[PDB]
A paper describes a structure:
CO2 directly modifies the gating of connexin26 (Cx26) gap junction channels and hemichannels. Cx26, like most connexins, can form unopposed membrane channels, called hemichannels and gap junction channels.
Using conditions similar to those used to obtain the structure of hCx26 at high PCO2, reconstructions were obtained at a resolution of 2.1 Å. Overall, the structure is very similar to the hCx26 gap junction channel structures including having lipid‐like density within the pore. As for other connexin structures, no density was apparent for the cytoplasmic loop between residues Arg 105 and Arg 125 (equivalent to Lys105 and Glu129 of hCx26, respectively) (Flores et al., 2020; Lee et al., 2020; Qi et al., 2022; Qi et al., 2023; Yue et al., 2021). In the GgCx26 structure, the linking region between the N‐terminus and TM1 is better defined than seen for the low PCO2 hCx26 structure. Thus, unlike human Cx26, the GgCx26 gap junction channel is insensitive to modest changes in PCO2.
Author numbering:
A (entry chain E), B (entry chain F), C (entry chain A), D (entry chain B), E (entry chain D), F (entry chain C): 9 to 105, 125 to 215
Write the structure that this text describes.
Amino acid sequence: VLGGVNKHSTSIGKIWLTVLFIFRIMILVVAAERVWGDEQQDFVCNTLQPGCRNVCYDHFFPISHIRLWALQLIFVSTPALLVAMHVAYTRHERKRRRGPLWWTYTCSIFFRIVFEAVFMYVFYYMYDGYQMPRLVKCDAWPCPNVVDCFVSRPTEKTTFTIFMLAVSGICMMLNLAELCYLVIKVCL
Amino acid sequence: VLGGVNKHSTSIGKIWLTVLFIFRIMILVVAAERVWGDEQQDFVCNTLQPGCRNVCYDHFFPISHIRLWALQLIFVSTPALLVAMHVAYTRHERKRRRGPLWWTYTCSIFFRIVFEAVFMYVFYYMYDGYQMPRLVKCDAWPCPNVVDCFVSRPTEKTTFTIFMLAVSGICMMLNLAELCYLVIKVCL
Amino acid sequence: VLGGVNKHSTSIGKIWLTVLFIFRIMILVVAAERVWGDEQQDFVCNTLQPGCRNVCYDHFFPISHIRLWALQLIFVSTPALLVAMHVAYTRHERKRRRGPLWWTYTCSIFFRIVFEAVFMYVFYYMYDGYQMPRLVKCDAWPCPNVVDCFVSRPTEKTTFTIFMLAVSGICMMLNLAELCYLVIKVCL
Amino acid sequence: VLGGVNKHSTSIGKIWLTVLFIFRIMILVVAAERVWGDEQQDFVCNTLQPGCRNVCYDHFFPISHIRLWALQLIFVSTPALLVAMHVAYTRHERKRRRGPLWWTYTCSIFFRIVFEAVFMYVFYYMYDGYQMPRLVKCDAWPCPNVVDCFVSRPTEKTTFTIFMLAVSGICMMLNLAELCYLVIKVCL
Amino acid sequence: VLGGVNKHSTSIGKIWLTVLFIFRIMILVVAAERVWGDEQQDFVCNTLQPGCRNVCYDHFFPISHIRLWALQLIFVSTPALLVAMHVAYTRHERKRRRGPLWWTYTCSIFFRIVFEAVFMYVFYYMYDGYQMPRLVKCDAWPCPNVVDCFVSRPTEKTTFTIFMLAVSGICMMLNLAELCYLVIKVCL
Amino acid sequence: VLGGVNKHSTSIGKIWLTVLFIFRIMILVVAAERVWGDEQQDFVCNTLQPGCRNVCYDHFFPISHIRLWALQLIFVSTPALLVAMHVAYTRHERKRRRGPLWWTYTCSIFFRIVFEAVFMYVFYYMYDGYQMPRLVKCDAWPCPNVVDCFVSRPTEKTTFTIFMLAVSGICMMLNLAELCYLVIKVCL
């Protein structure tokens, strides 16, 4: 909350973006330890081959969904943290002894859009959609021929995937709108 | 508590709604990790088919009850959080340099009613009542014919479902009463 | 502690009731996650029938003892919380612009007695005493004929049941004494 | 720490008793969840009789050691908490409008000795010493004849039992010394 | 944050190094209990020999990755903690009664580089790269001949290894730049 | 930190000893719940005898390594806590109404050395070195003849044992140096 206030921030940055960020954190907290907790423990494969459970789970879930969203939240909150430290350093220096603050705030908004877009593209490149399947067919060594494996709680995981994707998409649109608001105001 | 006080709020909003919100949170905290902890682990099905446990549990419990209530609490508390930030932003601007505060508070009450009603309808659309069955009959692939499966702690889960439904219904009535109090006062 | 002080409260309400409430909370904290943790996991039944463990445990323990005490503590502390908010609202209004405070405090004491009495009656209606048995005989479907099942830590659970029942009984007596003290003082 | 200071307390009550109380809490914290965590889970009995593990563990450990020490700490800290509230109530009343404080402090010391002595006598009546055996022989129904059962971590549990017994014995001696110091001073 | 500010610190030390340190801590928190939690529990070996799982896991993972990073963070933050205490001690002494502060800050930067370099060399000496294999072949006694063992979540562990190595490399470069900035300024 | 400052403390006690104490606590926190968590659970013995796992683990690990270090930290921090309370009691008395503070500080240093040496001797008397074996041969009843048992994570446990022993040895040397500094200063 505190690390989201600047003298150049409009109502969108002060209120709407801050609420959405808290919204994403709260959803992640209640859906991490309980929904994705038994992702590998309850991954069931119809085989007797030792080691087939480990390789098939790793093949279809190279990075867990919750770990991807945790990384995205850390990355998109970094520019806000950097700006806050710069403000304190400048405020300390000014007392001791647009402008520079305008460029730092504008640059932070640009990097927030880039990080938001990159992480959802990684999601689509890696899981080709939001729908978690009930069944995965795995043929990696040492599994003989093709082995059927069953995912844990596919429906609940799909529901939370739609929530995070929808909020992340809204966050980019708000960030894009704020970038346009600042640019046109200084230009015209 | 703090994010529930406005200069247009009556006694109902200041006291009764705040207590009920804390009441729902406290009940959720004591009944989440212990009552719904072993929902899938102690889901027992009378079969030898691999993967039948995963598909049958996911078929009858697409979203866990506690996750639905956690989502509802987050949604119904969002309008209160939005109003508080708007007050601080307006208070900061007024010093730096009915009305707008009346409309923001009135709009937040309307959205609280909508979110409360939507989540209760979703519950009845998804679980068709408050009574958790002891036995569920599942015929989804790969389960052969119809398989008997047994739920964990059905009676305790039914009791807490009644508590959350009753308090949610009371909270909707109180919000409706406060909305009527403000409308008639300004009209007459 | 703070939510237990009013200008009409005598020494009993200020000191003895506050200490007993903290006493009940402390006992519950140390005896919840460790004594009742494995209530169903270590519930052993002498049978080969799938699903008999789930139905027999649910039949004899419809609501866990710790969950009943947690609900009781929440209920008996609600009237105290309601009084505190009313005091703050009245104190704010008086500055901005017996009596009403006497009736609110008296009413809160009455509801504390009712909630205390109701929860112990529910305990006796549901578990017909304080002694937890070592053996339960269960004949609910699908268990064939009558099945022997064995409870986890029956002696330790009996000891803590006596503690909570005794303190709850003492708390009801103290509340009754305080109610009589206020009534006779105003009457005579 | 704060709830252990009174205007009639000598150096023993202010310093030595406070340090010992913190000493007992710290030892309990590091030795509860890890040493006694698997007391029943790793209780191994040489039998095939269902339910023999539950009844034999309950017969030889009716109350766990850590739960007994947790109860003792709660009881012996109650008189200190009662005195603190009485001081605040008297201090508030005096401003609003030996002696009584001397008797309350003296009575609290007496009850601390009684609670300390009662809990160790219960320990000796219940476990007849400090040495935890490696083997227990159990003949309670339904165990056939006599069944050998093996305790988890008997040596480590014995070591911590000696620590708590030694500190509890020292605490009584300090409390007894403080009681004698106050009595003779007022008498002579 | 507080233990990273000195009167001789430039913008790099005040802002960039502080953010990166928080960045490394945040990544470690979200990836410790969930990614490396089941490292040995889900270590599957294709054998019937008792004890082969323990010796093969210990042979290939003598120190866990998360424990190595936790040790590195503790070591690289020690010089900053030492400087802060020296500042407070000097500040207290000066009131009671370049220079010495310049040498202490310069020395702390040097030790941060050394600790950073040592821990990455230990990583390459011990795990000869960043890629975690799916399969390990173990022939330590008592495993007969050569036994195949399978690692848990090799792909996710590889991804986080790249993140920590990259940030640690960046932190070493920033520390080197700050050291050069101070040396040339005092020299010329 | 606060409980390590006295008016007679030199730079060694104020800075170096405080940092080392925090250093030992931080290492213990990250290496307790994860490295020693499965000490008995993953203790594997090559036998079919019931109860042999319990007696052999208890024979070779009478007290866990982490519990020994936790006890040592509590003991060596007690004299520092005792001194702080004595300072506050003396400071309160002086206002109400070398020297004594010099002897209390000197005595606390002496007891810190004794406790540090005693716990290190107990470690060598009990585990005869820092190297944890991979294999232990156990012949206690009821294990028939000699049974092979395998330790969990012996290499990682050895590494952390060296760390704690090295820091404890350094802490003893620093305490000895500070004791010599005070004695010679007062003598000459």
